[PDB]
Design an enzyme around this catalytic site. Structure first.
Site, PDB file in Angstrom:
ATOM      1  N   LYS A  98       0.953  -1.212   0.096  1.00  0.00           N
ATOM      2  CA  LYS A  98       0.007   0.140  -0.136  1.00  0.00           C
ATOM      3  C   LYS A  98       0.958   1.389  -0.039  1.00  0.00           C
ATOM      4  CE  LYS A  98      -3.833  -1.996   2.395  1.00  0.00           C
ATOM      5  NZ  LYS A  98      -5.023  -2.099   1.493  1.00  0.00           N
TER       6      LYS A  98
ATOM      7  N   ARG B 233     -10.123 -12.090   1.051  1.00  0.00           N
ATOM      8  CA  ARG B 233     -10.813 -12.968   0.088  1.00  0.00           C
ATOM      9  C   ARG B 233     -10.382 -14.473   0.298  1.00  0.00           C
ATOM     10  NH1 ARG B 233     -11.347 -10.113  -5.432  1.00  0.00           N
ATOM     11  NH2 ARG B 233     -11.023  -8.390  -4.036  1.00  0.00           N
TER      12      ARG B 233
HETATM   13 ZN   LIG Z   1      -5.534  -5.707   1.254  1.00  0.00          ZN
END
Ligand SMILES: [Zn+2]
Ligand SMILES: CC(C)C[C@@H](C(=O)N[C@H](C(=O)O)c1ccccc1)[C@H](O)C(=O)NO
Ligand SMILES: CC(C)C[C@@H](C(=O)N[C@H](C(=O)O)c1ccccc1)[C@H](O)C(=O)NO
Ligand SMILES: CC(C)C[C@@H](C(=O)N[C@H](C(=O)O)c1ccccc1)[C@H](O)C(=O)NO
Ligand SMILES: [Zn+2]
Ligand SMILES: [Zn+2]
Ligand SMILES: [Zn+2]
Ligand SMILES: [Zn+2]
Ligand SMILES: [Zn+2]
Lengths: 509, 510, 517
Positions: C301, C378
């Site tokens: 990120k 997920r």
């Molecule tokens: Zn993530």
């Protein structure tokens, strides 16, 4: 004079509120010695506790038994003096009339800064905006000098006032309790003047670019000069061509609004022993030109503020024209234009010629301010003045260097620089001195022109801009105030009118 | 003490050159009132012409040689001008009939030379030294310089002339003559300059050393070595003592590193009686990757970030100068929280709350603002020593490039007197520093919801906000902070400046 | 059970406040028809004015005090207006010559207060509670509220009033003083009395969740989180089981285990269970995303906007699940068996980390091509869903901070719900209505399914169709074969950006879901 339109619904003038509700406020100042009367309205005590987040203690005789019981140490102990904290209560007094009583915490430090005082005032303004009051009374159980007391009123007046010109119950009395009351009484009406000068300037800045353009701004400038009996002179394109002001005219080439050079003059009816020129950046909208403000962070919705300098100067003109200081001749100057994208716009790489004969290589069309100021500075020095002070939203780097509170001042003269800092101190518009570093001068050395508009570097952009401007003052004390970071109040989403009181104190003291 | 390795080819120490070719240069100073002798080598006249634009060069100085005097006659010299940085070389025969070389360096139009174009003057002189296999250099000062500027001339001459070849694999002068008026007063500046130079060059060596060579252990090892070659009391704190001292902010920064944290504490004490106790603190991040806030942004300069220990180098560089000059009536502590800011399974994370050695809890908002975390614990330690002045020096914020640029460093503080001493020190050391404000109005941006304080603001005055952070870990001591993030690296020459060394030494000496 | 450390100063457990000042507040509810007694602390009237926009204030409750009744007369009160959020303080003496404090909070002109409106009302109330040293607060409802709006009032009041100081040391508030008594005057009080302790329970479940989320990742890691959960199960007498790495290895949870490979903290799977004393008519599995910190992995990120400092939040789903476990464990519902599940791990950058492009094998045999290691949630949920379905349950509801796209779709107030069964989805919507935690139904668009067709693995992890919330739901659907399943994406609503703190979103939603069947 006639503002061009694209369609008939386009505004042809800037709406200006001259007679504000603030002017309807009768202000009375009393000395705390003798006790306080709590008849009508809202009464706020300014309290501190030299410790931190400490309890509130009122120490002033209140000529009312009911409100004294409220202000007893045991009851006020509930509350703390954290800077900005406030509580107000409604109650019946001895006359059982409904009165409101409360306080604003002034922290734990005896001597309040300008930033501290603003926070004190904003909280006060918050209580006034939520109450249908007739009178506000403020009790000073803190230490403030004459300048800070005036700063208090100015800030109160300015923040209290709300601009509703573009939209589709103010107090009528202000009471103040303070120790050396007779010494503070003179600061009241000066505050009222300083407030409007700032608020007037604010109005011009807040005015959107479809309302505030070079034509309408110069027209508004003339109207102010007329109301104050100031001599005025507006230079048009033909005269600017004759004056060979190529840098200033180049920035405005792409605009539908003709360039307008604003030249006001105040002259004293006595002996003239000081001549001062004030120059303000007057870019009614900064699109960036072909160097369009498209990068993440450029804040293009921002850029009506790029005439803040001009606003500060015109705001200053109001104050001087109202107070009419002695022994001075003051020139209020602004090279007003709009920086736009067009078939007619000036280009990156363009070499243009200023009114002093120097050719300039344009490296970035978004660096438009120094170009308009350059020609403005040449014009200023030809007037034969003692001091040239320019004020401008010139460089965004100021946000990274000084931030949003302190403006930067640059100059070629230490004495002039020092007078500005003193004015910053007495006006409480904070200014910090930054250096013009000669080593960076070589980065403006152009391969083809006499000088570069910009350095190839982003290193020291505010300093490089000062080096550039320095080239257009030959033998005059000159100072440059960069207000790009401090002009707009991002939290409150409005202008500050930064510079008006600063410049006024400079001319007066 | 032992440097950990990943492979056997990983270096276990920083190569350091102590005896440089500069130290082999015998330096003699003569008074101009007696003439200049040539014979040997290359002789350069420093000439200006005050009040003319680029005026003709005129030699002003008796030359004890009849026909290098004839050569230097104004009719012959009028050719040539004194434009700043201009230089020419002359070939001629002296009285004996032997071959000598002579020349000049233009010093512009301004009687009183620069601090910056004295550098250009020096740089011009060095150009003459590099393409030449000379045995002697003679410099004649026909310009006026005070005592401080003369020393600066030598320092800069020494620093720029010297070439670093430590990491290379696959003709220096031996004598320097100086002709100057009141030579007798200037002689004292000769060895002070040579000391100031190496302290600077020493710092330069540490800064230039790549991060696989210069790591927390090897740097701290080098500091110990310096303390031993000097004769300063020294102690290096490893992870275990640091845990006992509770230095959680500093330790967090290094959690992701393969190199254990090492806190450097050198001490110089005068044999005199002590009237001033000073703690000098240097940012010691041997490599700033940014951590999980990785330097992936385009202006990040991830490749130069071996430079993030410049403060420590300046402090150690100062330690050399102080340790050699042995000043009177003063006690000096050289502190540096050395570590490495890396990305790992063990690395500290954005959002983390850590506890400093003074008990204050800190919410980390950006792992690339790591220096103030290490400095905070370093500052708490400093005040515990009970000193009169605390000065930290650090390559802390990239915003300095936008504020003051690459020439002037910024100084912040809680004490005006200390600020002025730093400022005066800036004048006499000729390491330019400008006073910047600690704006208390921005302090509220450091108010954290869960911890005592935020590490960073959300919001842009990063240099000012960082100083506001630091101020919280100095409770009742005069303290100043020098941000040299912009001036530490000389981008043009692709080398460090060793900035700060001479400033700090002049600071302690006065 | 033992939390690994890098230095000795690394925290080895999450600090949790169980006995909060809110639990010490004695709460009484009285009927308005009997009048209000004012005679200590601060007394606040919740006022309206139906049909008058910023209309006048008028108190309409008999006040058993001549002095306070006279003060509150319409003649004295009209100077104030009922603008929603407006509040005022009054000072006066009662008949016994004692000083009392009275005031009001404007509830606007619209009869029916929204969940957003009620919060705004509460926020104004808490401001009066802050910076004031009260011992008693009395609240008078001169508006009409149903029981679950009334309950919502207390829960939110409690939640906002409470201030988390676990991580303060030298800046704890010097003036933190909580009231010891709370009085409520309302019409038909006996009908509302049942909601008080239900609110207190709902409050803490939410605050417990908030606490786990607000706790930084160095305090809250896969090990310390599982430990607090076990301690939570022990205090409630819940059956509990925590799976370690090689139990997870031999359940073949390759997707979940891959996400934690780069971490210094071992994966810990939380499995708490509530079973009713009686016969069971509904079996429910609650699955929460439990990423104690989301760095993004090798897909770090690093982009402007990634908000990497906020990513200790990534276990909000898990926290919502444990907060629900508290509520369920306390209220002890009938005829229900609940499984509280969370696959907890940390997504980090390491030599041991999994890579973009890696093909991993889930516990149901399907091979997955990793396209982005920041799409880690997920992956953990996939194996958790397979585990859930093996439990033989009727409804599987997962709750997760999955996609930042929710900020672009629904914003910060409404969570999104996806599912494979309309009956379950509507139940989610029904619980959303009664819990007052707003959720909106979004579609699982099968036409986008082809973008998950991998060239080499059975399935792609992500698309190459920027409708990311829908793509992720399509992914999750592939690991549920024959069970009604719904997915609540709380990425946009979990964090309160203005208040700089968590919301504890989902706890009341999930509990109301379990209680109403
Ligand atoms: Zn993530
Ligand atoms: C030289 C920069 C282009 C000036 C620009 C600036 O500070 N950019 C960052 C500023 O905003 C402007 O030129 N305004 O007109
Ligand atoms: C993150 C801290 C602000 C420090 C950091 C830095 O300045 N990063 C930024 C960048 O290079 O884009 C940046 C520059 C100017 C203004 C804001 C942000 C520097 O890398 C460091 O490690 N200092 O210790
Ligand atoms: C990469 C994932 C498909 C999306 C990622 C995401 O939504 N990124 C936005 C861009 C913000 C998500 O937030 C996540 O990291 N989940 O674990
Ligand atoms: Zn511009
Ligand atoms: Zn501009
Ligand atoms: Zn960094
Ligand atoms: Zn750094
Ligand atoms: Zn995630």
């Amino acid at each position: 004079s006639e503002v061009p339109q694209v369609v008939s619904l386009d505004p042809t003038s800037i709406p200006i509120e001259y007679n504000t509700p603030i002017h309807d406020i009768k202000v009375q100042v009393y000395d705390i010695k003798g006790g306080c009367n709590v008849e009508e309205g809202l009464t706020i005590f300014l309290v501190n506790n030299p410790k931190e987040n400490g309890p509130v203690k009122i120490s002033s005789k209140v000529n009312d038994k009911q409100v004294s019981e409220f202000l007893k140490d045991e009851n006020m102990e509930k509350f703390n003096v954290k800077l900005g904290t406030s509580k107000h209560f409604y109650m019946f007094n001895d006359n059982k009339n409904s009165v409101a009583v409360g306080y604003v915490g002034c922290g734990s430090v005896a001597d309040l800064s300008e930033a501290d005082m603003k926070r004190v005032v904003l909280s006060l303004v918050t209580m006034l905006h939520d109450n249908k009051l007739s009178k506000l009374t403020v009790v000073f159980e803190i230490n403030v000098d004459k300048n800070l007391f005036r700063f208090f009123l100015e800030t109160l007046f300015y923040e209290y006032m709300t601009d509703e010109r573009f939209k589709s119950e103010y107090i009528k009395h202000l009471g103040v309790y303070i120790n050396n009351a007779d010494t503070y009484k003179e600061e009241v009406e000066k505050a009222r003047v300083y407030y409007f000068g700032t608020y007037y300037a604010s109005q011009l800045i807040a005015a959107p670019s479809n309302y505030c353009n070079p034509v309408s701004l110069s027209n508004a400038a003339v109207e102010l000069a007329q109301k104050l009996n100031l001599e005025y002179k507006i230079l048009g394109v033909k005269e600017l061509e004759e004056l060979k002001m190529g840098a200033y005219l180049s920035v405005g080439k792409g605009s539908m609004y003709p360039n307008k050079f604003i030249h006001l003059t105040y002259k004293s009816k006595g002996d003239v022993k000081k001549k001062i020129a004030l120059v303000g950046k007057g870019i009614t909208f900064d699109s960036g030109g072909y160097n369009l403000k498209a990068a993440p962070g450029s804040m293009i919705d921002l850029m009506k503020f790029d005439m803040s300098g001009c606003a500060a100067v015109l705001g200053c003109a109001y104050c001087v024209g109202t107070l009419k200081p002695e022994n001075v001749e003051i020139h209020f100057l602004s090279a007003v234009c709009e920086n736009m994208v067009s078939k007619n716009s000036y280009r990156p790489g363009d070499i243009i010629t200023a009114s002093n004969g120097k050719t300039i290589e344009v490296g970035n069309t978004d660096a438009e301010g120094r170009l308009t100021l350059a020609d403005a500075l040449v014009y200023a020095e030809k007037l034969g003045v003692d001091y040239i002070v320019d004020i401008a939203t010139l460089t965004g780097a100021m946000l990274y260097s000084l931030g949003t509170s302190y403006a930067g001042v640059f100059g070629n003269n230490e004495e002039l620089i020092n007078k500005i800092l003193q004015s910053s101190k007495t006006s409480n518009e904070p200014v910090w001195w930054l250096p013009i570093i000669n080593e960076y001068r070589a980065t403006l050395n152009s391969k083809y022109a006499d000088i570069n508009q910009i350095s190839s570097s982003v290193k020291a952009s505010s300093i490089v801009a000062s080096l550039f401007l320095k080239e257009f003052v030959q033998n005059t004390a000159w100072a440059h105030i960069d207000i790009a970071g401090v002009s707009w109040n991002f939290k409150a989403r409005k202008p500050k009118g930064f510079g008006v009181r600063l410049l006024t104190e400079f001319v007066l003291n």
